[PDB]
Point group: D2
Amino acid sequence: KYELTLQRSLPFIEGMLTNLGAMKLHKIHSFLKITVPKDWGYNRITLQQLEGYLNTLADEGRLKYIANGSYEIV
Amino acid sequence: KYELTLQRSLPFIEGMLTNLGAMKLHKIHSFLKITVPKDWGYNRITLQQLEGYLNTLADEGRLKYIANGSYEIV
Amino acid sequence: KYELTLQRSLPFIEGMLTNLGAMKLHKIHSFLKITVPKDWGYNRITLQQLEGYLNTLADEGRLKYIANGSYEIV
Amino acid sequence: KYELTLQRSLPFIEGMLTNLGAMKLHKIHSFLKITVPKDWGYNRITLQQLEGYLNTLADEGRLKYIANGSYEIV
C-alpha cells in the first residue's frame, strides 16, 4: 500500500528486469508477490500502486517504459 | 541439449507459468537459465530444443499455446 | 498433508540441496513454503510429514542424512 | 571482489535472513551465488570478502552475529 514497501522492493524490480529483460506490468507484479520477502509485505500492494511507482521511476531516468506496455531497466 | 535435462526442468517450467501466468518462449528460456540448478545444466539447452519440448507439452494437454506466442499452463 | 504434494515438491527439495549443500529440516521446510508454487500447496504440510518424507528419501538412496541433523543430496 | 557488489547484494542478504532466519556464512554465500543477478557479479566474491562485509554489518547494528557461526537480521 505504501511507498516504503515499494522502496524496499526496488532492488528486486531491478534484479528482475536485469535478469529477464523488459517485462510487462502484470508480470512484474506477480513476480514481486513471490520474490519480495513476505514480512516486508508487498502482499498489500495493488497493481495501480505498482504502476504509479514504475512510472515515477520511468520519469526519473531509472527505467525506460517502451511502447506496447513493458518496462526495461536503464 | 537433451530431454532428461528438459524433463528435470519441467517442474520449474510449470511453477513459473503457475506463478506468473502465460509467458513467451524467450522469457521462459531466460528464466530457466537462472532458476534450474546449474548442476542439472539447462545452460546447454538451445531455444529450439526448448520450443520443441514446450510444443510437446502443449500437444499433450499440459500446456496451452495461445495465439501470438505465449504458453500458459492447463 | 499428502504424499502427492510431497511428490510434487521433490524437485525443489533436490534443487535446494543441490544449490546450497546440506540443510537442516526446519530450513528445508521454510524454504519449501516459499519456493513450491502455492497452488500445489505445501502450505498444508507439517514438519513431521516433511521429516517422514525426507527419511524415506534417505532410506532409498536419494538423500544422505548426516549426523547432527542435516540432509545432503546424493 | 569489491564493496560496490557487496553493497548491491545487501537487499538479497537481508531478504534471505528475513525469510529463513539466521544463516551460516557458507550458506549465505551459496545463496547469493544463485540469487544476485549475474550481471552485478557476485560470482567474483570470495567467502572471506563476504565474511568481512557481514562482520562490518554486525559491527554496526544491522546484523546480529550469534555464537556458533550464524548471522541474523536485526
